Design a protein around this motif. Structure first.
Motif, PDB file in Angstrom:
ATOM      1  N   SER A  40      39.863  33.178  30.139  1.00  0.00           N
ATOM      2  CA  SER A  40      39.310  34.350  29.477  1.00  0.00           C
ATOM      3  C   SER A  40      39.350  35.571  30.386  1.00  0.00           C
ATOM      4  CB  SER A  40      37.872  34.080  29.044  1.00  0.00           C
ATOM      5  OG  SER A  40      37.798  33.023  28.103  1.00  0.00           O
ATOM      6  N   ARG A  41      39.467  36.750  29.770  1.00  0.00           N
ATOM      7  CA  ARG A  41      39.535  38.030  30.487  1.00  0.00           C
ATOM      8  C   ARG A  41      38.136  38.478  30.958  1.00  0.00           C
ATOM      9  NH1 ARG A  41      42.958  42.654  30.786  1.00  0.00           N
ATOM     10  NH2 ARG A  41      41.874  44.115  32.181  1.00  0.00           N
ATOM     11  N   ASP A  42      37.525  37.624  31.742  1.00  0.00           N
ATOM     12  CA  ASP A  42      36.251  37.914  32.371  1.00  0.00           C
ATOM     13  C   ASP A  42      36.500  38.462  33.770  1.00  0.00           C
ATOM     14  OD1 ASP A  42      35.314  36.815  30.055  1.00  0.00           O
ATOM     15  OD2 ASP A  42      34.522  34.987  30.966  1.00  0.00           O
ATOM     16  N   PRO A  43      35.544  39.190  34.352  1.00  0.00           N
ATOM     17  CA  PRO A  43      35.680  39.587  35.759  1.00  0.00           C
ATOM     18  C   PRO A  43      35.714  38.369  36.670  1.00  0.00           C
ATOM     19  CG  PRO A  43      33.514  40.142  34.907  1.00  0.00           C
ATOM     20  CD  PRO A  43      34.376  39.832  33.731  1.00  0.00           C
ATOM     21  N   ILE A  44      36.566  38.448  37.700  1.00  0.00           N
ATOM     22  CA  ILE A  44      36.797  37.333  38.613  1.00  0.00           C
ATOM     23  C   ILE A  44      35.495  37.011  39.333  1.00  0.00           C
ATOM     24  CG2 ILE A  44      37.903  36.791  40.799  1.00  0.00           C
ATOM     25  CD1 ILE A  44      39.701  36.249  38.519  1.00  0.00           C
ATOM     26  N   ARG A  45      35.089  35.744  39.277  1.00  0.00           N
ATOM     27  CA  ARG A  45      33.834  35.261  39.834  1.00  0.00           C
ATOM     28  C   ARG A  45      33.870  33.747  39.803  1.00  0.00           C
ATOM     29  NH1 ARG A  45      28.380  37.132  40.319  1.00  0.00           N
ATOM     30  NH2 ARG A  45      28.996  39.234  39.633  1.00  0.00           N
ATOM     31  N   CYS A  46      33.401  33.114  40.872  1.00  0.00           N
ATOM     32  CA  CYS A  46      33.387  31.660  40.906  1.00  0.00           C
ATOM     33  C   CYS A  46      32.292  31.119  40.005  1.00  0.00           C
ATOM     34  CB  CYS A  46      33.230  31.141  42.329  1.00  0.00           C
ATOM     35  SG  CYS A  46      33.167  29.345  42.449  1.00  0.00           S
ATOM     36  N   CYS A  58      29.567  29.336  42.667  1.00  0.00           N
ATOM     37  CA  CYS A  58      29.047  30.164  43.750  1.00  0.00           C
ATOM     38  C   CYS A  58      29.414  31.617  43.488  1.00  0.00           C
ATOM     39  CB  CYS A  58      29.588  29.713  45.111  1.00  0.00           C
ATOM     40  SG  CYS A  58      28.628  28.389  45.885  1.00  0.00           S
ATOM     41  N   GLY A  59      28.824  32.521  44.254  1.00  0.00           N
ATOM     42  CA  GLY A  59      29.098  33.919  44.002  1.00  0.00           C
ATOM     43  C   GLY A  59      30.403  34.479  44.523  1.00  0.00           C
ATOM     44  N   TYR A  60      31.299  33.659  45.076  1.00  0.00           N
ATOM     45  CA  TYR A  60      32.521  34.167  45.693  1.00  0.00           C
ATOM     46  C   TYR A  60      33.443  34.788  44.650  1.00  0.00           C
ATOM     47  CZ  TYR A  60      35.577  34.441  49.733  1.00  0.00           C
ATOM     48  OH  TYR A  60      36.325  34.884  50.796  1.00  0.00           O
ATOM     49  N   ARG A  61      34.092  35.891  45.021  1.00  0.00           N
ATOM     50  CA  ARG A  61      34.899  36.661  44.082  1.00  0.00           C
ATOM     51  C   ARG A  61      36.379  36.736  44.451  1.00  0.00           C
ATOM     52  NH1 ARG A  61      31.910  39.581  40.451  1.00  0.00           N
ATOM     53  NH2 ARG A  61      33.543  41.176  40.244  1.00  0.00           N
ATOM     54  N   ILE A  62      36.903  35.774  45.206  1.00  0.00           N
ATOM     55  CA  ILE A  62      38.322  35.716  45.550  1.00  0.00           C
ATOM     56  C   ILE A  62      38.885  34.383  45.072  1.00  0.00           C
ATOM     57  CG2 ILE A  62      39.994  35.774  47.425  1.00  0.00           C
ATOM     58  CD1 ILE A  62      37.944  37.440  48.957  1.00  0.00           C
ATOM     59  N   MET A  63      40.025  34.424  44.383  1.00  0.00           N
ATOM     60  CA  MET A  63      40.644  33.240  43.806  1.00  0.00           C
ATOM     61  C   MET A  63      42.064  33.059  44.320  1.00  0.00           C
ATOM     62  SD  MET A  63      38.458  31.934  41.847  1.00  0.00           S
ATOM     63  CE  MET A  63      36.940  32.461  41.109  1.00  0.00           C
TER      64      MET A  63
END
Ligand SMILES: [Zn+2]
Ligand SMILES: [Zn+2]
Lengths: 50, 107, 50, 343, 50, 46, 66
Positions: free
Chosen positions: F18-24, F27-32
């Protein structure tokens, strides 16, 4: 017709080091094709080109 | 395909010819030169690698009398082959003799 | 392992002769890493790169 | 005397303080006054002998006497470059997740020596990416790293925390193609060493690949050469020009290797003689001393070579020298065929 | 960087190349080794005749 | 079938279709980071 | 990063000596006794173990894991 052939053995090709202080810094050489990437010449011609 | 090509010197009726041994290097060149130089009918013999990129050697032979240079070259190949045949028979005898002595001791 | 000697004449002016077997075993083997980056933005109008 | 100088000049490589002398080979017809140096097969077959002085697993030392440098150097060069072996050329990688880069991992797996006897396999043709029973082997490396389900509370060291955190060449399993499983008894097709580290892992990381060993010579790439090193040396004959007695005998025994000069008591007096000049490495320490430069003649016998062939494990070194001699016989045989084809 | 020096008296030219130089004593003094990658690019218009 | 991205901090599969903002997810990490390809790649051992 | 499989100068397999070499240094051999016990006669092989840095043992901490 004009055929744009590749450079082949015996082409007259100009050869020049970037800072030129005299006329011998640019001379014409007969090309010979060889596999490795560098330009190569006999070390007797190092003194004109510096 | 062909591994050998003969290039006669321009003025000379077959007593001077350059042998272009293809797909070769110093390994055959210096060994074959040695056997040709042992022939008393050879005046000049020597090899050069044309270029490090090229697997060719120009073996030059020049002979004294009238005899064509093909004959020293052929005698050179045969005698080198007979040397390497005799080297092998002596080597394999000494390995077997060493193994038989070592197995005969401590038994 | 450097031998300081004159060999083959391809080493006249600072040039140095290397060994083929050493290079095959891993002498001087190096990695070059390069980037490539792309940005997908949301505009002032409600439209977007995709 | 002129004759004595000629004999040294055609039979001994002599070592000076500043340079070696008599280096070239000179016994050719017409180079000398009375000597008849023309080729004589019977004189060669009489003088030539081979003495094997040491041999064990992966090492061999033997003496060749009466052969020339131009032929002994050919044997050295064949063993380095022209005796073929089996080595990995293609790696097909499925899910490499280790830190070791795939191009680095493929380079490492190439250099592992494979125990396959190279005489039983042919050269793979140009192209032909698959290959067949006749001309390829195959290995499969597959390692998954996981945590150890039990561990002490200190948990400090990897060898307790993890399992398969080190990849070793013993993880290579041979995968038979065609009827190879009957031609080779189990364990013949293996990597030699059984302890070479390739990668090193952490849990969750995985390596799965497939190797293709083919035949090639060492002139192509250096992972095909069967020898650790192959070399020779001429044999020393250190000779004492004047008798060295007294306490100069002790300092003459320390200017050499630790087993060549012996000092012996003849009348309760120490005299020195050469005992085993083979063990000398020619460090040329007799020329630092000022009194004893003029009593020794460091030399080398020209026609007496001491080959040292250390194999890497593919096939034992007595078979390596026999294979190497046949290659030079094969090179001479090929050009005899082309003199017959032209004429 | 003006017209008279930068674009009129001297100017950038095509059918030109540049590479590192390295020695080769087996070439004659009138020769230069040109790599295949440059030779396939640098073409000469040969007019077709008998 | 859905694309799976691997979290940088904790190595956890997130399945961001889904076109959601990137977020784990955990956990709160935001890099994939993208996972490795299934297809085989052949390397010369040289 | 990781110990090379073969010595650059001669091709002796030095790539399996590494896990032994670190072990002998726990038994307080000197470096020159430890290399002699593994069979490294020539100094071109000796510098493989003597000059190596075990970087992969430290890059693998940062490396991601479950
Ligand atoms: Zn996370
Ligand atoms: Zn070494």
């Amino acid at each position: 017709d004009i055929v744009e052939r590749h450079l082949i053995d015996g082409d007259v090709v100009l050869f020049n080091r970037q800072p030129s202080l005299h006329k011998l810094s640019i001379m014409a050489h007969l090309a010979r094709v060889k596999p490795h990437r560098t330009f190569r010449f006999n070390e007797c011609v190092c003194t004109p080109y510096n | 395909k062909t591994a050998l090509e003969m290039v006669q010197a321009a003025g000379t009726d077959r007593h001077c010819v350059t042998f272009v041994l293809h797909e070769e290097d110093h390994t055959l060149g210096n060994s074959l030169r040695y056997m040709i130089m042992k022939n008393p009918e050879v005046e000049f013999c020597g090899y050069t690698t044309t270029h490090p990129s090229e697997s060719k050697i120009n073996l030059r032979i020049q002979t004294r009398g009238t005899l064509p240079a093909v004959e020293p070259f052929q005698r050179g190949l045969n005698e080198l082959m007979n040397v390497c045949q005799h080297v092998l028979d002596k080597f394999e005898a000494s390995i077997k003799d060493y193994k038989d002595q070592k197995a005969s001791r401590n038994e | 392992t450097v031998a300081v000697m004159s060999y083959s004449g391809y080493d006249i002016e600072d040039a140095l002769v290397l060994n083929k077997a050493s290079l095959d075993r891993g002498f001087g083997r190096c990695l070059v890493y390069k980037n490539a980056k792309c940005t997908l933005k949301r505009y002032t109008n409600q439209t977007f790169d995709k | 005397a002129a004759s004595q100088a000629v004999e040294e000049m055609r039979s001994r490589v002599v070592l000076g303080e500043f340079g070696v002398r008599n280096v070239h080979t000179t016994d050719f017809p017409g180079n000398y006054s009375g000597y008849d140096d023309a080729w004589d097969q019977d004189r060669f077959e009489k003088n030539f002998r081979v003495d094997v002085v040491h041999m064990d697993e992966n090492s061999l030392e033997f003496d060749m006497v009466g052969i020339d440098a131009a032929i002994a150097n050919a044997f050295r060069r064949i063993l380095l470059a022209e005796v073929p072996t089996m080595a990995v050329e293609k790696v097909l990688v499925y899910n490499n997740t280790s830190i070791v880069q795939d191009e680095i991992l493929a380079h490492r797996l190439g250099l592992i020596p494979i125990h396959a006897d190279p005489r039983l396999f042919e050269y793979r043709n140009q192209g032909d990416e698959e290959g067949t029973e006749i001309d390829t082997l195959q290995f499969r490396l597959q390692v998954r790293c996981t945590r150890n389900p039990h561990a002490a509370k200190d948990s400090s060291d990897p060898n307790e925390l993890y399992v398969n955190h080190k990849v070793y060449t013993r993880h290579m399993t041979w995968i038979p193609l065609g009827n190879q499983a009957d031609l080779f008894p189990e364990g013949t097709i293996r990597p030699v060493h059984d302890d070479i580290l390739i990668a090193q892992l952490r849990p969750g990381q995985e390596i799965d690949l497939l190797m293709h060993c083919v035949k090639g010579i060492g002139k192509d790439h250096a992972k095909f050469s069967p020898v650790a090193t192959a070399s020779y040396r001429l044999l020393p004959d250190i000779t004492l020009l004047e008798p060295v007695e007294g306490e100069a005998a002790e300092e003459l025994s320390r200017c050499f290797s630790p087993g060549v000069i012996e000092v012996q008591e003849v009348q309760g007096k120490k005299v020195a003689r050469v005992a085993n000049p083979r063990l000398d490495t020619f460090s040329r320490e007799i020329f630092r001393n000022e009194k004893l430069k003029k009593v020794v003649r460091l030399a080398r016998v020209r026609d007496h070579y001491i080959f040292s062939v250390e194999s890497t494990g593919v096939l034992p070194p007595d078979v390596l020298v026999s294979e190497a001699i046949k290659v030079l016989m094969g090179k001479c045989r090929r050009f005899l065929d082309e003199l017959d084809a032209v004429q | 960087q003006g017209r008279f020096r930068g674009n009129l008296s001297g100017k950038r030219v095509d059918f030109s190349g540049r590479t590192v130089i390295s020695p080769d004593p087996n070439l004659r003094i009138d020769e230069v080794a040109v790599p295949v990658h440059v030779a396939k690019i640098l073409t000469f218009p040969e007019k077709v005749n008998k | 079938q859905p694309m799976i991205y691997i979290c940088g901090e904790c190595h956890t599969e997130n399945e961001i279709k889904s076109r959601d903002p990137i977020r784990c997810r955990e956990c709160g990490y935001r890099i994939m980071y993208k996972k490795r390809t299934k297809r085989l790649v052949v390397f010369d051992a040289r | 990063m990781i110990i090379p499989v073969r010595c650059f100068t001669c091709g002796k397999i030095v790539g399996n000596k590494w896990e032994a070499y670190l072990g002998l240094l726990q038994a307080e051999y000197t470096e020159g006794d430890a290399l002699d016990a593994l069979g490294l006669k020539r100094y071109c092989c000796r510098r493989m173990l003597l000059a190596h840095v075990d970087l992969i043992e430290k890059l693998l901490n940062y490396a991601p894991l479950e």
